[PDB]
Amino acid sequence: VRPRLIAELARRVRALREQLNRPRDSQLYAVDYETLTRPFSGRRLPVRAW
Amino acid sequence: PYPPLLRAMIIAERQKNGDTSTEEPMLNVQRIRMEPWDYPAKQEDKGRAKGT
Amino acid sequence: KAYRGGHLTIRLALGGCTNRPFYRIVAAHNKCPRDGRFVEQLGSYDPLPNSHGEKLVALNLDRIRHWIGCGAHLSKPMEKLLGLAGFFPLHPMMITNAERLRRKRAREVLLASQK
Amino acid sequence: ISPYKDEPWKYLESEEYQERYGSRPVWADYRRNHKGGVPPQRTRKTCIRRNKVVGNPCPICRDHKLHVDFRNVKLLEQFVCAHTGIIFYAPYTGVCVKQHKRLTQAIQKARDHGLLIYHIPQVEPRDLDFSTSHGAVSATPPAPTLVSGDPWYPWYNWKQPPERELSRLRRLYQGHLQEESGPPPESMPK
Amino acid sequence: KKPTFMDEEVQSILTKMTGLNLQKTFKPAIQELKPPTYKLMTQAQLEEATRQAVEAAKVRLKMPPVLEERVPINDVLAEDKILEGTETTKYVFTDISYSIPHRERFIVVREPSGTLRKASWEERDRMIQVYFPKEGRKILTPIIFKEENLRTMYSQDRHVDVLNLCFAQFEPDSTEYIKVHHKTYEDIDKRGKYDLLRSTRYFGGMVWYFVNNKKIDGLLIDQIQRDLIDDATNLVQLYHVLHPDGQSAQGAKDQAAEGINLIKVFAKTEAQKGAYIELTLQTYQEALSRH
Amino acid sequence: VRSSVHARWIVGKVIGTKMQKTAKVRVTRLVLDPYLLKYFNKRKTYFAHDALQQCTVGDIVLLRALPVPRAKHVKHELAEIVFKVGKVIDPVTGKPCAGTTYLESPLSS
Amino acid sequence: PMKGRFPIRRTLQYLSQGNVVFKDSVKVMTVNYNTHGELGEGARKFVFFNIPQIQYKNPWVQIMMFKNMTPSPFLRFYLDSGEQVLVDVETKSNKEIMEHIRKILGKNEETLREEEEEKKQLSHPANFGPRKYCLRECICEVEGQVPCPSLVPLPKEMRGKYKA
Amino acid sequence: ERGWSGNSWGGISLGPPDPGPCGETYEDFDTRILEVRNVFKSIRVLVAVGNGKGAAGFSIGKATDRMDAFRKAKNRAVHHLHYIERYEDHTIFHDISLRFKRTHIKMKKQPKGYGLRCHRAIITICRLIGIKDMYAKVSGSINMLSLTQGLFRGLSRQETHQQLADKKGLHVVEIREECGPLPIVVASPRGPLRKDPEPEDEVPDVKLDWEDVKTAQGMKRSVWSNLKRAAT
Amino acid sequence: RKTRHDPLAKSKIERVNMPPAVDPAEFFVLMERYQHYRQTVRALRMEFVSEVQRKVHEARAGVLAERKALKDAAEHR
RNA sequence: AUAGGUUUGGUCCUAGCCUUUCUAUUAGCUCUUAGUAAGAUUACACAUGCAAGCAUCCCCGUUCCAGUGAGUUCACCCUCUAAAUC
Ligand code: FES
Ligand SMILES: [K+]
Ligand SMILES: [K+]
Ligand SMILES: [Mg+2]
Ligand SMILES: [Mg+2]
Ligand SMILES: [Mg+2]
Ligand SMILES: [Mg+2]
Ligand SMILES: [Mg+2]
Ligand SMILES: [Zn+2]
């Protein structure tokens, strides 16, 4: 089997970059009260919570 | 009580094996405690939104 | 084949032809296709009434009990079928639908009386 | 027009049939026209197309007095092997597919009516034990609910919720409420 | 107690009365044929092969048990009135677990009214044939069993074929099985066709029916005419043990009747056609003396 | 359950002894020819651990599977020497033999 | 004609006529026999006629043969436990050898019947599926049930084209 | 009616043989042409005759005119008749494998209703003989004269059940699958019967044919075998 | 079906899934019915699990299996 | 293969080619109705519109289903043992 080292390198780099670029609670759980959407993702909250 | 068909099978097997008890087959539900759907869950096991 | 997560479920796989459905009650991985690979066939269900006016349901109850005891889930139509068989309690939604149909027919009868 | 339509079997003990065929099968002298030494593996579909016969009609279609009927047992026997009871395949006798299907149906009907003798084997019993004592075929003791006329479980019946719970739900679903439903009809409305 | 049809004594009497004709028992079947095989055999080897064939014939002639008509199944497992009117057709639920005897297999019906009940015998048989098909059985009753078709079969002297079809189609304790067997026996008795069932597994059942219905005159006549005097005497003895309180048995005890004397006492006491029995017996005795 | 090696017990002939504490053994099995329906010998090479170096080229040995492979190709060990090359002891009578003749007569004891 | 002496040996019927199914303990069978000498004659026939049948019925059992290594012919069986079973076959006929090995290390007929019954359970007759696995494809093949639309067109009322 | 083909002489009937100089009539015999060949001009014809009851023969006739050749061949054939033994007057007594020169013929006894599954010339000759059920395979050179000669030799050298019983001094017992384990004695020795049984041969040293075995085991895949054909 | 890399449809940018209207009485009765049904079903599932594990234990180290193993070992001896 | 045609002035033998059988695709010409099944040549490039949401916010899902046959002994059995369901 030909070694697949680029895959391992990519996996390790992605893991490192995810554990150094963690989004914080202030970013993840912020809300725009006028539109009731998460600015981090843009996804609208369910109606029953508005 | 057991469901009708399952109760019938339990009784039929009981009679086949020679036992002639008249006691109804019965399901214990004491150990099945019904938790309200809004009871707090384990936050430790919950995931997190991935950065992107 | 390894699926990410998933579980065994007892469900209905559709066979037959156009306008003529037939169901095989099978235990299969929930991620597998509806009519694809399965672990074991646990019965059948012909939804069309036959020449005797009957809907035939075959249930391999020993194997159904075995697979439930092995951690298999159940699709809602399968739960309703087992409720009709008397193997399970009648599903809440069957009772609710029966009550809703009763109320609708009462409304229709009241309309007829009003007219 | 044949005078034997109502009673086809008559044609087989008429002297005309004896002159034409004698004691040999009605298909004995027939021969298919084809290229090569190996014939095609199916016969023609039908010798009669829009009330017109083809050049070489098959044994059944060449004689209009021969009627494929389940009561014409003597004719049907000529298309069944007397030593094995197996219906000859169509290229064996040269009958077209239509008449072969008709003969097969007639033979099956004659066998089902007891008019054609066929081998009926002797089989073993379905079950080893003939007891009828099991609960599957005997009577199961009625459950107490079945005696008392109650549902199998109490929750099968509608119970009006308390007013406090209904008010709590009306507070929870402000502005998205539908008309409150009372207890359902006790029986199915007719 | 009164003997059963499976009693070893009754079984032995009926086995000897049936007979064992190898040529009839192993008549050439009309089926797909294969080239025969050939063996060089001594006299001893031929005798051993004949004995093995006799054993195979004995296995083939084993008598089906005679069963009483099954009682109808009328049992309600539940009455869920909430489901009434929600469905237009009944549901039939068959438990198809492999290792269960078919008479211990749970088959239930959910009716449109909401009643969960047990299946009837006919429904049970139909479902078992649906899911566990048996060679020779059909889901729907064949039309051969109608009155006119069975009359045709009788007119062709194909009674054994009718009984084989009945055995393949119906269960022994079913109403249809009992009715068809009884009508075949009645035809045989009415037309003196007892030899048709000899050396078959149905002769014992036919004899049992005749004895239990007190109509052994025709069979006794046939046995006397075929010079099977031992069979007739055994038939009379079986009649006596089945009906030990009848006039015939008491007369046989009183007169110490044995052998042909038993037949004479039966003809004088409890024969619907005793005069013709006496005539045939006298003819048999006269021919025996002449020979 | 006791081993991860497929071949549990195998009889073979020693064909090599040039490795340290390892015997190279030739094992033949009978394989059916699908077309001819005749059984032919199929050969496979096995490395067997021989701690004492008691194996000689040409002797018939029994090999038992190791619980786990001790090397890339060494998955078995020498359970015993069934037939020492040129030093066969007749298992039936227990006497030494040279081919089909008794070196020591069975009657001698 | 078929090549070789006794070509019947190279037929599947002959190979399946074998009656020795070894227990699961037997792993290896060594057959030591002599090419010459009347006393081992039966053993030679055992190699000629019965080893193919034994191998056919026991594919995973290693069978190995040895010639003219000992004064007498013998069989040795090696078991999974490490036990070895020695069977002297000198002065015996090949039938005697077959019967002996069947008796001492062969599965009895009861166990084989139990295995066959266990096999039967896998092919459940009530299961519907391909002919390769099931007696029937679909419930439409059962008499009295609604037939396939391929053969019998369904009435206009139960078809979606005329229900819409 | 046509022969094996529309333009072929083979299979054509020539009618009954003419009354002979010996004074015998042959109205119960039928004649069939097997081959017609130009000899370089004259004509050589191979014909076969038979009464359908085991009496059959064949002959070569050479003449400048075809009809004279037919007559010569037919008249000579009636005076060189074979008698062919038939098992139950419908088939042969046992399988026959023969080679005449380079032509191999392998014939198999078959049950009733099997019909004649044979080379067309063999079908014609079997109809003349009265054999109604048989299988035959012809291999090697397909030479009509050699085929006819080999067929007649093989059919004339078959051992009946009675001959086998007299030779071995034992009962010949027939086992039929349709008749169960019933032993049917088809032949018994006319002389005394041996009290010693035949050696129960564990494995007979019979020469098997790879075609028969391959057909039995299911590795014969020929698209030409077991094809539907007209009744023969 | 779409993968997580496929963009959302432009026709669905402004879509709100309005929750369905609620009937208080039926809602409450349905909640109670689901609770009771799920309790019964969990009891049945636990019984089936106990049955399965019991069958496994009986197959591996049951009295019948022990006697069979002893008989087989002896008969081999 | 139940075989057949074809080398020579002729016979026999050997030997190839072809015919007869059954499927699939495409082409010509010709085609009425009903039911069912199946349905790009191309791992070439793609306009356009849809194919993943749900839900009192967290999460969960979008790693599935659906598609293709480019590459190609990763698929099967045993041992061991994660993740997952109960
Ligand atoms: S295959 Fe069953 S309906 Fe078509
Ligand atoms: K969610
Ligand atoms: K590919
Ligand atoms: Mg022409
Ligand atoms: Mg050629
Ligand atoms: Mg030329
Ligand atoms: Mg076209
Ligand atoms: Mg784990
Ligand atoms: Zn026609």
CA distances from G35 to E36, H16, H18 (A): 40, 67, 70
Report the distance separating Cα E277 and Cα E266, nearest Å: 9
Distance of alpha carbon G4 from the chain centroid: 25
For residue D88, which of D54, D127, D120, D59 has the smallest C-alpha distance? D59
Q: Torsion angle, CA of D9/D13/D16/D17, rounded to 10 degrees?
A: 70
Residue closest to sugar C1' of J35 by CA: G153
Nearest CA to ligand 1 atom 3: G148
- B8/E contact by beta carbon, under 8 A: yes
DSSP state of H160: P
Amino acid identity of H141? S
CA distances from H159 to A31, H164, H167, I46 (A): 106, 7, 10, 78
- D135/C contact by beta carbon, under 8 A: no
**Dihedrals φ, ψ of E36, to 5°?**
-70, 165
Distance in angstroms between the alpha carbons of the first and the last residue of chain F? 45
Asked if H124 and H32 touch (Cβ cutoff 8 Å), the reply is: yes
CB pairs under 8 A between C and E: 68
D135 to chain B: which residues are within 8 Å by CB? 8-9, 11-12, 15-16
Chain C residues 72-101 with a CB less than 8 Å from chain B:
85-89
Distance in Å from J27's C1' to D36's CA comes to 26
Decide: G142 in ligand 1 pocket, CB within 6 A: no
For residue G148, which of H94, C19, H37, H222 has the smallest C-alpha distance? C19
Distance of alpha carbon F61 from the chain centroid: 2
Report the distance separating Cα E207 and Cα D189, nearest Å: 60
User: How many CB atoms within 10 Å of residue D84?
Assistant: 18
User: How many CB atoms within 10 Å of residue G43?
Assistant: 26
Q: What token pair was written down for E109?
A: 């019906």
* Contact assignment for G160 to C19 by CB distance below 8 Å: yes
Asked if E207 and E14 touch (Cβ cutoff 8 Å), the reply is: yes
Asked if B31 and I50 touch (Cβ cutoff 8 Å), the reply is: no
Residue of C14, C18, C19, C20 to mutate, ligand 1, most atoms within 8 A of C-beta: C20
Decide: G136 in ligand 1 pocket, CB within 6 A: no
Report the distance separating Cα H143 and Cα E123, nearest Å: 68
User: How many CB atoms within 10 Å of residue D128?
Assistant: 9
CA distances from H121 to E291, H39, H86, H128, H171 (A): 62, 22, 19, 11, 36
Please, which residues have CB within 8 angstroms of residue D62's CB and are 6 or more apart in sequence?
Answer: D30, D47, D53
Q: In the block, which residue shows the tokens 């046509």?
A: H2
DSSP state of C4: S
D93 to chain H: which residues are within 8 Å by CB? 231
DSSP lists the bridge partners of residue G74 as G32, G88
Alpha-helix runs per DSSP H in chain I: 24-61, 63-76
For residue E188, which of E147, E164, E222, E212 has the smallest C-alpha distance? E222
**Per 3-state DSSP, what percentage of chain H is helix, strand, and coil (rounded to 5)?**
25, 25, 50
Report the distance separating Cα C88 and Cα E116, nearest Å: 13
What is the sign, positive or negative, of the torsion defined by CA atoms of E121, E126, E129, E134?
Answer: positive
Asked if A40 and A23 touch (Cβ cutoff 8 Å), the reply is: yes
DSSP state of A32: B
DSSP state of H187: E
Asked if H164 and H187 touch (Cβ cutoff 8 Å), the reply is: yes
Asked if H81 and H28 touch (Cβ cutoff 8 Å), the reply is: no
Q: What token pair was written down for E67?
A: 């069963």
Q: What token pair was written down for B8?
A: 């019938």
Report the distance separating Cα E151 and Cα E149, nearest Å: 5
Report the distance separating Cα D137 and Cα H108, nearest Å: 57
Question: In chain J, which nucleotides are within 7 Å of a protein Cβ?
Answer: 1-4, 9-14, 19-22, 34-37, 49-66, 77-80, 82-86
Decide: C14 in ligand 1 pocket, CB within 6 A: no
Report the distance separating Cα E172 and Cα E65, nearest Å: 8
* Contact assignment for G11 to H217 by CB distance below 8 Å: yes
User: How many CB atoms within 10 Å of residue B36?
Assistant: 6
Report the distance separating Cα G6 and Cα G2, nearest Å: 9
Q: What token pair was written down for C45?
A: 């269900």
- B5/E contact by beta carbon, under 8 A: yes
Asked if G62 and G29 touch (Cβ cutoff 8 Å), the reply is: yes
Which 3 state secondary structure label does DSSP give H82? strand
Total domains, chain G: 1
Burial class (CB in 10 A: 0-12, 13-18, 19+), D187: exposed
User: How many CB atoms within 10 Å of residue F82?
Assistant: 23
Give the H or E element holding residue H168: helix H161-168
Report the distance separating Cα E134 and Cα E167, nearest Å: 12
Helix C76-85 to helix C92-114 angle (10° resolution) is 80
Please, which residues have CB within 8 angstroms of residue H43's CB and are 6 or more apart in sequence?
Answer: H36, H37, H62, H63, H64, H65, H66, H69
Query: Which technique was used to obtain these atomic coordinates?
Result: cryo-EM
Report the distance separating Cα F44 and Cα F24, nearest Å: 10
**Nearest Cα residue in chain E from C49:** E89
Asked if F33 and F52 touch (Cβ cutoff 8 Å), the reply is: no
Asked if H113 and D82 touch (Cβ cutoff 8 Å), the reply is: yes
- Which nucleotide comes closest to I9 if you measure CA to C1'? J50
Amino acid identity of B49? A
User: Where do the domains of chain C lie?
Assistant: 1-115
For residue E156, which of E144, E141, E170 has the smallest C-alpha distance? E144
Report the distance separating Cα E170 and Cα B46, nearest Å: 63
The resolution in angstroms reads 2.5
Three-state SS for G98-153 is HHHHHHHHECCHHHHHHHHHHHHHHCCCCCECCCCCCCECCHHHCCCCCCCCCCCC
Residue closest to sugar C1' of J55 by CA: A46
CB pairs under 8 A between E and H: 84
Q: What token pair was written down for G99?
A: 């019967």
Report the distance separating Cα B25 and Cα B22, nearest Å: 9
**Nearest Cα residue in chain D from B2:** D152
Using alpha carbons only, give the angle D15, D17, D22 rounded to the nearest 5 degrees: 95
Amino acid identity of A47? V
Helix E8-18 to helix E229-242 angle (10° resolution) is 150
Report the distance separating Cα F46 and Cα F25, nearest Å: 5
Please, which residues have CB within 8 angstroms of residue B43's CB and are 6 or more apart in sequence?
Answer: none
- Which nucleotide comes closest to C8 if you measure CA to C1'? J85
Please, which residues have CB within 8 angstroms of residue H103's CB and are 6 or more apart in sequence?
Answer: H138, H139, H140, H141, H142, H143, H146, H147, H150
Determine if residue C79 is left, alpha or beta; phi over 0 gives left, psi from -120 to 50 gives alpha, anything else beta. alpha
DSSP string, G37-97: -GGGHHHHHIIIIIHHHHHHH-TTSEEEEEESSSSS-EEEEEETTS-EEEEE-TT--HHHH
Report the distance separating Cα E243 and Cα E9, nearest Å: 15
G135 to chain E: which residues are within 8 Å by CB? 133
Give the H or E element holding residue H138: strand H134-140
Return the partners of chain B (3 or more C-beta pairs < 8 Å): A, C, D, E, I
DSSP state of F107: G
Decide: G154 in ligand 1 pocket, CB within 6 A: no
Q: Tell how strand C73-74 and strand C8-17 pair up.
A: parallel
B27 to chain I: which residues are within 8 Å by CB? 40, 43-44, 47
Return the partners of chain G (3 or more C-beta pairs < 8 Å): C, E, F, H
Q: Tell how strand H30-39 and strand H42-50 pair up.
A: antiparallel
Please, which residues have CB within 8 angstroms of residue B26's CB and are 6 or more apart in sequence?
Answer: B1, B2
Residue G94 belongs to what domain range? 1-164
Burial class (CB in 10 A: 0-12, 13-18, 19+), D107: buried
**Dihedrals φ, ψ of E276, to 5°?**
-70, -30
CA atoms within 13 A on the CB side of G52: 22
Report the distance separating Cα C27 and Cα E13, nearest Å: 56
Q: What token pair was written down for D92?
A: 């064996």
Asked if F78 and F55 touch (Cβ cutoff 8 Å), the reply is: yes
Burial class (CB in 10 A: 0-12, 13-18, 19+), E170: buried
Q: Tell how strand E76-79 and strand E37-41 pair up.
A: unpaired
CA atoms within 13 A on the CB side of D188: 16
Report the distance separating Cα H116 and Cα H132, nearest Å: 6
CB D37 within 7 Å, strand J: yes
Report the distance separating Cα E150 and Cα E129, nearest Å: 23
Three-state SS for D2-70 is CCCCCCCHHHHCCHHHHHHHCCCCCCCCCCCCCCCCCCCCCCCCCCECCCCECCCCCCCCCCCCCCCCC
DSSP lists the bridge partners of residue C15 as C22
Three-state SS for chain E is CCCCCCCHHHHHHHHHHHCCCHHHHCCCCCCCCCCCEEEEECHHHHHHHHHHHHHHHHHHCCCCCCCCCCCCCCCEEEECHHHCCCCCCEEEEEECCCCCCHHHCCEEEECCCCEEEECCHHHHHHHHHHHCCCCCCCCCCCHHHCHHHHHHHHHCCCHHHHHHHHHHHCCCCCHHHHHHHHHHHHHHHHHCCHHHCCCCCCHHHHHHHHHHCCCCHHHHHHHHHCCCHHHHHHHHHHHHHHCCCCHHHHHHHHHCCCCHHHHHHHHHHCCCCHHHHHHHHHHHHHHHHHC
Q: What token pair was written down for G23?
A: 């227990």
Report the distance separating Cα H165 and Cα H171, nearest Å: 6
Report the distance separating Cα D155 and Cα D162, nearest Å: 16
Q: Which residues of D lie inside 8 Å of B (Cβ-Cβ)?
A: 134-136, 138, 140-141, 143-145, 152-153
Report the distance separating Cα E74 and Cα E118, nearest Å: 7
Q: In the block, which residue shows the tokens 């050179």?
A: H141
CB I64 within 7 Å, strand J: no
Report the distance separating Cα H130 and Cα H86, nearest Å: 8
Report the distance separating Cα H52 and Cα H56, nearest Å: 8
**Nearest Cα residue in chain E from G140:** E130
Which contacts qualify for E20-23: CB closer than 8 Å, 24 or more apart?
A: E20/E54, E20/E57, E20/E58, E20/E61, E20/E199, E21/E198, E21/E199, E22/E50, E22/E53, E22/E54, E22/E57, E22/H182, E23/H182
How big is chain E, counted in residues? 291
Please, which residues have CB within 8 angstroms of residue E169's CB and are 6 or more apart in sequence?
Answer: E136, E137, E138, E141, E142, E145, E176
G140 to chain E: which residues are within 8 Å by CB? none
Asked if C26 and C10 touch (Cβ cutoff 8 Å), the reply is: yes
Cβ burial D151-180 (10 Å sphere, 16+ → b, else e): bbbebbbbeebeeeebeebeeebeeeeeee
Asked if H228 and D89 touch (Cβ cutoff 8 Å), the reply is: yes
Gyration radius from chain F CA atoms? 17
Report the distance separating Cα G58 and Cα A4, nearest Å: 43
What is the sign, positive or negative, of the torsion defined by CA atoms of D73, D74, D75, D81?
Answer: positive
Using alpha carbons only, give the angle G22, G23, G28 rounded to the nearest 5 degrees: 65
Quick one: which ligand is closest to C15's CA? 1
Report the distance separating Cα H68 and Cα C67, nearest Å: 89
Please, which residues have CB within 8 angstroms of residue I43's CB and are 6 or more apart in sequence?
Answer: B27, B28, B29, B32
DSSP state of G161: H
Asked if D113 and E152 touch (Cβ cutoff 8 Å), the reply is: yes
* Contact assignment for D166 to I23 by CB distance below 8 Å: no
Burial class (CB in 10 A: 0-12, 13-18, 19+), H188: middle
**Dihedrals φ, ψ of C92, to 5°?**
-55, -35
CA of H6 to the centre of ligand 4 (A): 4
Report the distance separating Cα I69 and Cα I64, nearest Å: 9
Max Cα-Cα span within chain H:
67
Burial class (CB in 10 A: 0-12, 13-18, 19+), E216: buried
Beta strand spans in A1-50 (E): none
Q: What token pair was written down for E214?
A: 């007190």
CB G158 within 7 Å, strand J: no
Distance of alpha carbon I72 from the chain centroid: 39
Report the distance separating Cα C57 and Cα C50, nearest Å: 12
Amino acid identity of H28? D
Residue of G138, G152, G154, G158 to mutate, ligand 1, most atoms within 8 A of C-beta: G138
Decide: C15 in ligand 1 pocket, CB within 6 A: no
CA of H45 to the centre of ligand 6 (A): 20
Using alpha carbons only, give the angle H133, H138, H143 rounded to the nearest 5 degrees: 120
For residue C11, which of C25, C22, C23 has the smallest C-alpha distance? C25
DSSP state of A35: T
Which 3 state secondary structure label does DSSP give D104? helix
